Design an enzyme around this catalytic site. Structure first.
Site, PDB file in Angstrom:
ATOM      1  N   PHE A 191      19.364 -51.866   0.648  1.00  0.00           N
ATOM      2  CA  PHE A 191      18.946 -52.133  -0.660  1.00  0.00           C
ATOM      3  C   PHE A 191      17.533 -52.725  -0.546  1.00  0.00           C
ATOM      4  O   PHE A 191      17.044 -53.768   0.397  1.00  0.00           O
ATOM      5  CB  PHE A 191      19.859 -53.140  -1.314  1.00  0.00           C
ATOM      6  CG  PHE A 191      19.748 -53.062  -2.600  1.00  0.00           C
ATOM      7  CD1 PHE A 191      20.473 -52.269  -3.678  1.00  0.00           C
ATOM      8  CD2 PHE A 191      19.058 -54.253  -3.623  1.00  0.00           C
ATOM      9  CE1 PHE A 191      20.604 -52.079  -4.886  1.00  0.00           C
ATOM     10  CE2 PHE A 191      19.210 -54.302  -4.916  1.00  0.00           C
ATOM     11  CZ  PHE A 191      19.789 -53.053  -5.638  1.00  0.00           C
TER      12      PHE A 191
ATOM     13  N   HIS B 100      13.544 -56.647  -4.413  1.00  0.00           N
ATOM     14  CA  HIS B 100      13.803 -56.809  -5.940  1.00  0.00           C
ATOM     15  C   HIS B 100      13.775 -58.468  -6.127  1.00  0.00           C
ATOM     16  O   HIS B 100      13.961 -59.177  -4.944  1.00  0.00           O
ATOM     17  CB  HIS B 100      15.099 -56.439  -6.304  1.00  0.00           C
ATOM     18  CG  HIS B 100      16.387 -56.901  -5.775  1.00  0.00           C
ATOM     19  ND1 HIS B 100      16.620 -56.599  -4.375  1.00  0.00           N
ATOM     20  CD2 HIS B 100      17.201 -57.950  -6.066  1.00  0.00           C
ATOM     21  CE1 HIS B 100      17.687 -57.440  -4.163  1.00  0.00           C
ATOM     22  NE2 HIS B 100      17.878 -58.337  -4.931  1.00  0.00           N
TER      23      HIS B 100
ATOM     24  N   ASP C 228      15.971 -61.084  -8.683  1.00  0.00           N
ATOM     25  CA  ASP C 228      17.385 -61.079  -9.350  1.00  0.00           C
ATOM     26  C   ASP C 228      17.257 -61.201 -10.761  1.00  0.00           C
ATOM     27  O   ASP C 228      16.404 -61.983 -11.442  1.00  0.00           O
ATOM     28  CB  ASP C 228      18.200 -62.152  -8.755  1.00  0.00           C
ATOM     29  CG  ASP C 228      18.701 -61.950  -7.243  1.00  0.00           C
ATOM     30  OD1 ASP C 228      18.535 -60.801  -6.803  1.00  0.00           O
ATOM     31  OD2 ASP C 228      19.589 -62.743  -6.674  1.00  0.00           O
TER      32      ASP C 228
ATOM     33  N   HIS D 106      13.230 -60.200  -2.493  1.00  0.00           N
ATOM     34  CA  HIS D 106      14.017 -59.933  -1.288  1.00  0.00           C
ATOM     35  C   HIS D 106      14.565 -58.759  -1.199  1.00  0.00           C
ATOM     36  O   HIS D 106      14.675 -58.026  -2.045  1.00  0.00           O
ATOM     37  CB  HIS D 106      15.263 -61.171  -1.186  1.00  0.00           C
ATOM     38  CG  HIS D 106      16.175 -61.130  -2.234  1.00  0.00           C
ATOM     39  ND1 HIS D 106      15.612 -61.731  -3.608  1.00  0.00           N
ATOM     40  CD2 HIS D 106      17.472 -60.801  -2.549  1.00  0.00           C
ATOM     41  CE1 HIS D 106      16.735 -61.659  -4.547  1.00  0.00           C
ATOM     42  NE2 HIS D 106      17.751 -61.016  -3.951  1.00  0.00           N
TER      43      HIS D 106
HETATM   44  C1  LIG Z   1      23.455 -60.707  -4.111  1.00  0.00           C
HETATM   45  C2  LIG Z   1      22.952 -59.547  -2.998  1.00  0.00           C
HETATM   46  C3  LIG Z   1      23.224 -58.186  -3.189  1.00  0.00           C
HETATM   47  N1  LIG Z   1      22.603 -57.330  -4.303  1.00  0.00           N
HETATM   48  C4  LIG Z   1      22.996 -56.770  -5.434  1.00  0.00           C
HETATM   49  O1  LIG Z   1      24.012 -56.831  -6.086  1.00  0.00           O
HETATM   50  C5  LIG Z   1      21.929 -56.196  -6.552  1.00  0.00           C
HETATM   51  C6  LIG Z   1      20.522 -57.077  -6.605  1.00  0.00           C
HETATM   52  S1  LIG Z   1      20.952 -58.798  -6.473  1.00  0.00           S
HETATM   53  N2  LIG Z   1      22.407 -56.351  -7.991  1.00  0.00           N
HETATM   54  C7  LIG Z   1      22.991 -55.320  -8.848  1.00  0.00           C
HETATM   55  O2  LIG Z   1      23.610 -54.371  -8.670  1.00  0.00           O
HETATM   56  C8  LIG Z   1      22.992 -56.022 -10.333  1.00  0.00           C
HETATM   57  C9  LIG Z   1      24.393 -55.839 -11.042  1.00  0.00           C
HETATM   58  C10 LIG Z   1      24.930 -57.043 -11.889  1.00  0.00           C
HETATM   59  C11 LIG Z   1      26.331 -56.873 -12.431  1.00  0.00           C
HETATM   60  N3  LIG Z   1      26.927 -55.422 -12.145  1.00  0.00           N
HETATM   61  C12 LIG Z   1      26.415 -57.503 -13.676  1.00  0.00           C
HETATM   62  O3  LIG Z   1      26.628 -56.805 -14.605  1.00  0.00           O
HETATM   63  O4  LIG Z   1      26.093 -58.706 -14.103  1.00  0.00           O
HETATM   64  C13 LIG Z   1      23.400 -56.967  -1.914  1.00  0.00           C
HETATM   65  O5  LIG Z   1      23.843 -57.571  -1.070  1.00  0.00           O
HETATM   66  O6  LIG Z   1      23.092 -56.139  -2.249  1.00  0.00           O
HETATM   67 FE   LIG Z   2      19.353 -60.105  -4.880  1.00  0.00          FE
END
Ligand SMILES: C=C[C@@H](NC(=O)[C@H](CS)NC(=O)CCC[C@H](N)C(=O)O)C(=O)O
Ligand SMILES: [Fe+2]
Length: 329
Positions: A209, A212, A214, A268
């Site tokens: 990933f 980005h 958060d 990150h």
């Molecule tokens: C926390 C780290 C994690 N990253 C992630 O999950 C990435 C960026 S933090 N985030 C997302 O997809 C956001 C969706 C939020 C969730 N569906 C909602 O409706 O509130 C990873 O390990 O990839």
């Molecule tokens: Fe994140």
């Protein structure tokens, strides 16, 4: 070779109690971390994280293709038009390795006023069948409240750290209305590992990933003991060490908005690692109409140019923006 990021371990237990000076000392550590890499580990948090990992593993390893379709968000299943946020985010063998299950506020039932108004970003959770996944809904809902409790304590730390009264954020973070989410992410071991699921950074680093900030006020994360996260600092990307006894905490862009970037939302990314592992974030979001006045703790008068922004508007613009930059997850 890559430097290790300064990510201090902070004993947050005083944030649950009534020793005010001890709380200020914790708040000082939060301030220092927030102004350095933007990451810290909350230790002594009181959560049973062995059970969290265990029960999440059971679920991920036993759910079938059929149940995934039945719980799928609308990006994977066009029958499910109300499921923008909550449900199953499928893997695509040969293309996309990651898969996940998202749920929201358990008080969001068909009789909750926001669900009856059809307010955007509010949904009723979907759950797999109880006989196939015994105890899973009960566990996951109880988890939501345990991590809610930790997160409220943390938010008292952040308030104190910024020179405010302790409930400054926490009073907008309420069981009845919070837009906070839990995502149970599975990162699988695969061989051959699908190359389309690996992205290459500008520095050659293989990623699951990309970079980005958060979409959150703060993010409260439990991960397995496999090193994967990197944070951008002035010196380049640095590795965040694993610690599967603590919660990894960082600010999201709402905190940066509120503080005129005094507490930045650290950039990150996630390294590609070919290993079975778990990432279980709790995204601390406020209620749909929370509109804290932006301020600026660098300035004597504490005043900021920035316009108030309702958490609901922030969250809706934010979730659609993170899907277009970094792909559907
Ligand atoms: C926390 C780290 C994690 N990253 C992630 O999950 C990435 C960026 S933090 N985030 C997302 O997809 C956001 C969706 C939020 C969730 N569906 C909602 O409706 O509130 C990873 O390990 O990839
Ligand atoms: Fe994140």
């Amino acid at each position: 070779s890559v430097s290790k990021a300064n990510v201090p371990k902070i004993d947050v237990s005083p944030l649950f109690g009534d020793d005010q000076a001890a709380k200020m000392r914790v708040a000082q550590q939060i301030d220092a971390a927030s102004r350095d890499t933007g990451f810290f580990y909350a230790v002594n948090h009181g959560i049973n994280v062995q059970r969290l990992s265990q029960k999440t593993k059971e679920f991920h390893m036993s759910i079938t293709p059929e149940e995934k379709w039945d719980l799928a968000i609308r990006a994977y299943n066009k029958e499910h038009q109300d499921q923008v946020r909550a449900g199953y985010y499928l893997s695509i063998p040969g293309k996309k390795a990651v898969e996940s299950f998202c749920y929201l506020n358990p008080n969001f039932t068909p009789d909750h006023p926001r669900i009856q108004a059809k307010t955007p970003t509010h949904e009723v959770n979907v759950w797999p069948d109880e006989t196939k996944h015994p105890g899973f809904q009960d566990f996951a809902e109880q988890y939501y409240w345990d991590v809610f409790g930790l997160s409220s304590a943390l938010l008292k730390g952040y308030a104190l750290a910024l020179g405010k009264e302790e409930n400054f954020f926490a009073r907008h973070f309420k069981p009845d209305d919070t837009l906070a989410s839990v995502v149970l992410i599975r990162y699988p071991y695969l061989d051959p590992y699908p190359e389309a699921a690996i992205k290459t950074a500008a520095d050659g680093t293989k990623l699951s990933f990309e970079w980005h900030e958060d979409v959150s006020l703060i993010t409260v994360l439990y991960q397995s003991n496999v090193q994967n996260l990197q944070v951008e600092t002035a010196a380049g990307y640095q590795d965040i060490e694993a610690d599967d006894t603590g919660y990894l905490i960082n600010c999201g862009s709402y905190m940066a908005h509120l503080t005129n970037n005094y507490y930045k939302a650290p950039i990150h990314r996630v390294k590609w690692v070919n290993a079975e592992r778990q990432s279980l974030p709790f995204f601390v979001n406020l209620g749909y109409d929370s509109v804290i006045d932006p301020f600026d703790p660098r300035e004597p008068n504490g005043k900021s140019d920035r316009e108030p922004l309702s958490y609901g508007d922030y969250l809706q613009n934010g979730l659609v923006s993170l899907i277009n930059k970094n792909g559907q997850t």
